[PDB]
mmCIF file of all heavy atoms in Angstrom:
data_model
loop_
_atom_site.group_PDB
_atom_site.id
_atom_site.type_symbol
_atom_site.label_atom_id
_atom_site.label_comp_id
_atom_site.label_asym_id
_atom_site.label_seq_id
_atom_site.Cartn_x
_atom_site.Cartn_y
_atom_site.Cartn_z
ATOM 1 N N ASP A 22 -3.275 62.262 65.879
ATOM 2 C CA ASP A 22 -4.237 63.338 65.368
ATOM 3 C C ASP A 22 -4.005 64.582 66.157
ATOM 4 O O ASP A 22 -3.370 64.610 67.241
ATOM 5 C CB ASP A 22 -5.658 62.827 65.447
ATOM 6 C CG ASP A 22 -6.112 62.514 66.839
ATOM 7 O OD1 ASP A 22 -5.342 62.588 67.759
ATOM 8 O OD2 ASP A 22 -7.316 62.195 66.988
ATOM 9 N N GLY A 26 -8.740 66.199 71.739
ATOM 10 C CA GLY A 26 -8.152 65.303 72.698
ATOM 11 C C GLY A 26 -9.216 64.573 73.528
ATOM 12 O O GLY A 26 -10.290 65.111 73.828
ATOM 13 N N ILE A 27 -8.906 63.374 73.933
ATOM 14 C CA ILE A 27 -9.857 62.606 74.741
ATOM 15 C C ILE A 27 -9.872 63.228 76.130
ATOM 16 O O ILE A 27 -8.793 63.535 76.694
ATOM 17 C CB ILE A 27 -9.380 61.148 74.809
ATOM 18 C CG1 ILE A 27 -9.428 60.466 73.413
ATOM 19 C CG2 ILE A 27 -10.163 60.337 75.810
ATOM 20 C CD1 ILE A 27 -8.800 59.108 73.330
ATOM 21 N N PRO A 28 -11.037 63.355 76.734
ATOM 22 C CA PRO A 28 -11.129 63.974 78.090
ATOM 23 C C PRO A 28 -10.352 63.047 79.104
ATOM 24 O O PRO A 28 -10.521 61.836 79.144
ATOM 25 C CB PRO A 28 -12.641 63.981 78.394
ATOM 26 C CG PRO A 28 -13.269 64.010 77.061
ATOM 27 C CD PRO A 28 -12.421 63.160 76.132
ATOM 28 N N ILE A 43 -13.313 54.962 79.219
ATOM 29 C CA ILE A 43 -13.592 54.502 77.853
ATOM 30 C C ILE A 43 -12.727 53.287 77.498
ATOM 31 O O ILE A 43 -13.121 52.479 76.602
ATOM 32 C CB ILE A 43 -13.398 55.643 76.799
ATOM 33 C CG1 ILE A 43 -11.914 56.095 76.800
ATOM 34 C CG2 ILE A 43 -14.329 56.799 77.107
ATOM 35 C CD1 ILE A 43 -11.575 57.021 75.655
ATOM 36 N N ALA A 49 -19.097 53.396 76.780
ATOM 37 C CA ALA A 49 -18.739 54.590 77.559
ATOM 38 C C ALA A 49 -18.109 55.590 76.657
ATOM 39 O O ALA A 49 -17.040 55.305 76.079
ATOM 40 C CB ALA A 49 -17.816 54.232 78.710
ATOM 41 N N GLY A 50 -18.732 56.737 76.478
ATOM 42 C CA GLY A 50 -18.145 57.763 75.679
ATOM 43 C C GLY A 50 -19.117 58.890 75.483
ATOM 44 O O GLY A 50 -20.302 58.901 76.000
ATOM 45 N N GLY A 51 -18.732 59.897 74.653
ATOM 46 C CA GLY A 51 -19.506 61.054 74.390
ATOM 47 C C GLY A 51 -20.227 61.044 73.083
ATOM 48 O O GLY A 51 -20.786 62.094 72.701
ATOM 49 N N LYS A 52 -20.280 59.886 72.380
ATOM 50 C CA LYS A 52 -20.952 59.809 71.094
ATOM 51 C C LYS A 52 -22.380 59.308 71.264
ATOM 52 O O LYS A 52 -22.964 58.802 70.282
ATOM 53 C CB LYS A 52 -20.143 58.780 70.173
ATOM 54 C CG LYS A 52 -18.799 59.273 69.757
ATOM 55 C CD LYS A 52 -18.146 58.237 68.815
ATOM 56 C CE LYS A 52 -16.885 58.772 68.243
ATOM 57 N NZ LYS A 52 -15.781 58.997 69.330
ATOM 58 N N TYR A 58 -20.448 65.728 69.621
ATOM 59 C CA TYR A 58 -20.316 65.373 68.209
ATOM 60 C C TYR A 58 -21.712 65.568 67.615
ATOM 61 O O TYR A 58 -22.617 64.773 67.814
ATOM 62 C CB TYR A 58 -19.830 63.946 68.020
ATOM 63 C CG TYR A 58 -18.397 63.765 68.392
ATOM 64 C CD1 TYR A 58 -17.891 62.453 68.597
ATOM 65 C CD2 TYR A 58 -17.548 64.810 68.647
ATOM 66 C CE1 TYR A 58 -16.613 62.206 69.007
ATOM 67 C CE2 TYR A 58 -16.232 64.571 69.009
ATOM 68 C CZ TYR A 58 -15.773 63.270 69.221
ATOM 69 O OH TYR A 58 -14.445 63.066 69.590
ATOM 70 N N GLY A 62 -19.656 59.176 62.929
ATOM 71 C CA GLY A 62 -19.894 57.813 62.594
ATOM 72 C C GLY A 62 -19.988 56.918 63.817
ATOM 73 O O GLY A 62 -20.711 55.899 63.727
ATOM 74 N N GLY A 63 -19.197 57.181 64.788
ATOM 75 C CA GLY A 63 -19.258 56.328 66.001
ATOM 76 C C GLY A 63 -20.507 56.538 66.816
ATOM 77 O O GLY A 63 -20.877 57.648 67.152
ATOM 78 N N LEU A 64 -21.190 55.439 67.058
ATOM 79 C CA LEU A 64 -22.482 55.529 67.821
ATOM 80 C C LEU A 64 -22.637 54.471 68.893
ATOM 81 O O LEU A 64 -23.546 54.603 69.735
ATOM 82 C CB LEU A 64 -23.682 55.437 66.851
ATOM 83 C CG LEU A 64 -23.996 54.082 66.263
ATOM 84 C CD1 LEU A 64 -25.432 54.096 65.673
ATOM 85 C CD2 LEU A 64 -23.034 53.674 65.180
ATOM 86 N N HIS A 65 -21.772 53.371 68.918
ATOM 87 C CA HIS A 65 -21.936 52.306 69.860
ATOM 88 C C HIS A 65 -21.217 52.585 71.151
ATOM 89 O O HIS A 65 -21.814 52.573 72.270
ATOM 90 C CB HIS A 65 -21.456 51.011 69.253
ATOM 91 C CG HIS A 65 -22.309 50.520 68.110
ATOM 92 N ND1 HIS A 65 -21.934 49.476 67.298
ATOM 93 C CD2 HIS A 65 -23.484 50.897 67.672
ATOM 94 C CE1 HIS A 65 -22.871 49.249 66.417
ATOM 95 N NE2 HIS A 65 -23.825 50.128 66.563
ATOM 96 N N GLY A 66 -19.907 52.860 71.110
ATOM 97 C CA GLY A 66 -19.127 53.227 72.250
ATOM 98 C C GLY A 66 -18.292 52.086 72.816
ATOM 99 O O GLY A 66 -17.806 52.206 73.922
ATOM 100 N N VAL A 67 -18.094 51.003 72.018
ATOM 101 C CA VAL A 67 -17.308 49.817 72.470
ATOM 102 C C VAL A 67 -16.062 49.612 71.587
ATOM 103 O O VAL A 67 -15.255 48.775 72.010
ATOM 104 C CB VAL A 67 -18.122 48.575 72.496
ATOM 105 C CG1 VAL A 67 -19.265 48.729 73.552
ATOM 106 C CG2 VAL A 67 -18.703 48.225 71.146
ATOM 107 N N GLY A 68 -15.902 50.282 70.491
ATOM 108 C CA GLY A 68 -14.828 50.063 69.573
ATOM 109 C C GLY A 68 -13.455 50.184 70.134
ATOM 110 O O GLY A 68 -12.609 49.244 69.970
ATOM 111 N N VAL A 69 -13.175 51.322 70.764
ATOM 112 C CA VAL A 69 -11.800 51.482 71.356
ATOM 113 C C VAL A 69 -11.565 50.484 72.471
ATOM 114 O O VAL A 69 -10.425 50.025 72.650
ATOM 115 C CB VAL A 69 -11.643 52.974 71.808
ATOM 116 C CG1 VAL A 69 -12.575 53.267 72.989
ATOM 117 C CG2 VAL A 69 -10.209 53.213 72.209
ATOM 118 N N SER A 70 -12.617 50.111 73.205
ATOM 119 C CA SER A 70 -12.492 49.107 74.237
ATOM 120 C C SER A 70 -12.102 47.715 73.611
ATOM 121 O O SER A 70 -11.302 47.022 74.148
ATOM 122 C CB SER A 70 -13.729 48.985 75.068
ATOM 123 O OG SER A 70 -14.819 48.491 74.274
ATOM 124 N N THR A 114 -4.091 63.263 70.436
ATOM 125 C CA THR A 114 -4.077 61.984 71.106
ATOM 126 C C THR A 114 -3.340 60.988 70.232
ATOM 127 O O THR A 114 -3.539 60.925 69.091
ATOM 128 C CB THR A 114 -5.490 61.502 71.355
ATOM 129 O OG1 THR A 114 -6.162 62.437 72.165
ATOM 130 C CG2 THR A 114 -5.503 60.158 72.101
ATOM 131 N N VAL A 116 -2.550 56.905 69.893
ATOM 132 C CA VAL A 116 -3.135 55.595 70.192
ATOM 133 C C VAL A 116 -2.222 54.551 69.409
ATOM 134 O O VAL A 116 -2.431 54.439 68.207
ATOM 135 C CB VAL A 116 -4.574 55.480 69.826
ATOM 136 C CG1 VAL A 116 -5.103 54.033 70.057
ATOM 137 C CG2 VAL A 116 -5.460 56.458 70.577
ATOM 138 N N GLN A 284 -21.135 46.031 64.968
ATOM 139 C CA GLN A 284 -20.039 46.942 65.217
ATOM 140 C C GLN A 284 -19.273 47.225 63.912
ATOM 141 O O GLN A 284 -18.712 48.294 63.705
ATOM 142 C CB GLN A 284 -19.153 46.379 66.281
ATOM 143 C CG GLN A 284 -18.092 47.314 66.866
ATOM 144 C CD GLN A 284 -16.855 47.468 65.933
ATOM 145 O OE1 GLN A 284 -16.466 48.596 65.602
ATOM 146 N NE2 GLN A 284 -16.311 46.331 65.567
ATOM 147 N N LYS A 286 -20.426 47.663 61.136
ATOM 148 C CA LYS A 286 -21.090 48.729 60.407
ATOM 149 C C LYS A 286 -21.230 48.429 58.915
ATOM 150 O O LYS A 286 -21.103 49.210 58.049
ATOM 151 C CB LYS A 286 -20.488 50.119 60.642
ATOM 152 C CG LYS A 286 -20.565 50.596 62.008
ATOM 153 C CD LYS A 286 -19.945 51.978 62.191
ATOM 154 C CE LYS A 286 -19.975 52.467 63.616
ATOM 155 N NZ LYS A 286 -19.307 53.755 63.763
ATOM 156 N N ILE B 9 -18.464 62.028 78.800
ATOM 157 C CA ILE B 9 -18.424 60.566 78.709
ATOM 158 C C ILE B 9 -19.596 59.932 79.500
ATOM 159 O O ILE B 9 -19.597 59.971 80.740
ATOM 160 C CB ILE B 9 -17.070 60.029 79.217
ATOM 161 C CG1 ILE B 9 -15.881 60.677 78.447
ATOM 162 C CG2 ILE B 9 -17.042 58.520 79.177
ATOM 163 C CD1 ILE B 9 -15.902 60.337 76.935
HETATM 164 N N1 LIG D 1 -9.824 59.304 68.785
HETATM 165 C C1 LIG D 1 -10.696 59.715 69.771
HETATM 166 N N2 LIG D 1 -10.853 61.056 69.906
HETATM 167 C C2 LIG D 1 -11.751 61.492 70.830
HETATM 168 N N3 LIG D 1 -12.532 60.754 71.603
HETATM 169 C C3 LIG D 1 -12.349 59.455 71.443
HETATM 170 C C4 LIG D 1 -11.500 58.867 70.513
HETATM 171 N N4 LIG D 1 -11.533 57.467 70.559
HETATM 172 C C5 LIG D 1 -12.457 57.239 71.478
HETATM 173 N N5 LIG D 1 -12.956 58.379 72.043
HETATM 174 C C6 LIG D 1 -13.987 58.474 73.102
HETATM 175 O O1 LIG D 1 -14.206 57.178 73.630
HETATM 176 C C7 LIG D 1 -15.510 56.760 73.405
HETATM 177 C C8 LIG D 1 -15.592 55.333 73.005
HETATM 178 O O2 LIG D 1 -14.948 55.190 71.723
HETATM 179 P P1 LIG D 1 -15.428 54.051 70.733
HETATM 180 O O3 LIG D 1 -15.552 52.764 71.444
HETATM 181 O O4 LIG D 1 -14.594 53.999 69.440
HETATM 182 O O5 LIG D 1 -16.930 54.557 70.240
HETATM 183 P P2 LIG D 1 -17.551 54.022 68.918
HETATM 184 O O6 LIG D 1 -17.021 54.783 67.773
HETATM 185 O O7 LIG D 1 -19.094 54.146 68.996
HETATM 186 N N6 LIG D 1 -17.051 52.442 68.693
HETATM 187 P P3 LIG D 1 -18.101 51.701 67.554
HETATM 188 O O8 LIG D 1 -19.343 52.553 67.333
HETATM 189 O O9 LIG D 1 -18.561 50.337 68.141
HETATM 190 O O10 LIG D 1 -17.381 51.488 66.255
HETATM 191 C C9 LIG D 1 -16.117 57.720 72.326
HETATM 192 O O11 LIG D 1 -17.515 57.915 72.462
HETATM 193 C C10 LIG D 1 -15.355 59.028 72.630
HETATM 194 O O12 LIG D 1 -15.981 59.761 73.690
#
Side-chain angles (χ1 to χ4, degrees):
Chain A
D22 61 357
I27 296 170
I43 63 170
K52 293 181 175 67
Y58 292 165
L64 74 164
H65 293 171
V67 298
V69 66
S70 66
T114 300
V116 176
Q284 190 282 127
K286 294 180 182 179
Chain B
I9 302 299

